[PDB]
Amino acid sequence: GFTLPRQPTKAYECENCSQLSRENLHDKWEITNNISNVRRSYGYKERISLEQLQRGVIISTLAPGAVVRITPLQNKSIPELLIKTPKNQLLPLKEASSLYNQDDEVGNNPLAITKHQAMLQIKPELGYGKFILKSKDITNKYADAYMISVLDKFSITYLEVETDSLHYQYGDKLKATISLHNDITEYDVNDVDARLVGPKGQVISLNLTKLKSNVFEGTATLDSELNDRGENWYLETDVQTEYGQEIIRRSGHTAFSYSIPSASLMNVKKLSSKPLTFVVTVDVATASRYALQSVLFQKGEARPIQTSQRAQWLEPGKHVLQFTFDNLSDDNLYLGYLRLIDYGQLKTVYQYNQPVKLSQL
Ligand SMILES: [Ca+2]
Description:
Distance between the termini: 5 Å
Number of strands: 28
GO molecular function: metal ion binding
Protein name: DUF4785 domain-containing protein
Order of helices and strands: EEEEHEEEEHEEEEEEEEEEEEEEEEEEEE
Largest sheet: 6 strands, antiparallel
Organism: Legionella pneumophila subsp. pneumophila (strain Philadelphia 1 / ATCC 33152 / DSM 7513)
Pfam families: DUF4785_1st (PF16024), DUF4785_2nd (PF20942), DUF4785_3rd (PF20943)
Bound molecules: calcium ion
Keywords: Calcium, Metal-binding, Signal
CATH superfamily of the largest domain: Uncharacterised protein PF16024, DUF4785
Shape: elongated
């Protein structure tokens, strides 16, 4: 017998669990022998209102040829838009795009600026800096709000974000690193905002600390009790600073997985050698369909021989799950991992990824 690391279980309210299969199934398959969520952004995204568009919204770029996208957040029309260049030339938005993009007789060219959406690449001749996007008028037919996306395509200034893990569970502390880089300039950042957004739109704000002039660390406790149903969480951050007369604005995102520890593995023992059968004790908090997956491994070459999977419906309480391999001596074999999946969450809720020699079972 081998005792596995303890993991207190946590119950969750599941809406789709009743629809899951109640079939007790065992599968086996042959097999043979992402690490980081680091993400860089060369632009930013923001939500703006029609009231802000009327007054004018700052579009800040650091290099020529930035790409700008304006989409309504309601199923309504976009206003006729104007853009003020950094040299205070007021233009119809279309006149800030190339002659090619303004031409309706190219055919292959998309009608990139319409009443439904507006997308453009700023002509390199207009340079870079502070552009002002403004509405020509306001009516009760335009959308209330818009998503502005700015890709500063040819800027060497980027925002780098990452979390200390790809996967978390209920009660874990998440740590994020947020850094603003340019290999020529050293920035001093003070205006930073960051949060965690869940699949149902639930928000967990990050508590930030300044590590360096351009580096921030953020922490939060992940304590959502909701089922993510296979969907992921995102770290969202927004940074703004100034370097001389230039606005440095970057926003970034990175994904991470989250689960509720709805069930845990406790003890694993070898039941038989012919056929190679193992039994694992499981503590279940929420009635759902669970799958226990394991891999049999074999100077010396270590390689997987077969994967086994036991999937069944489990009510709250203690259970014994059985899994078998086809098959070599006990000394030349070991269990590569012990993973437990909750199909109600479509997440691994328990995993032991350390080798377990059969001589320990
Ligand atoms: Ca701000």
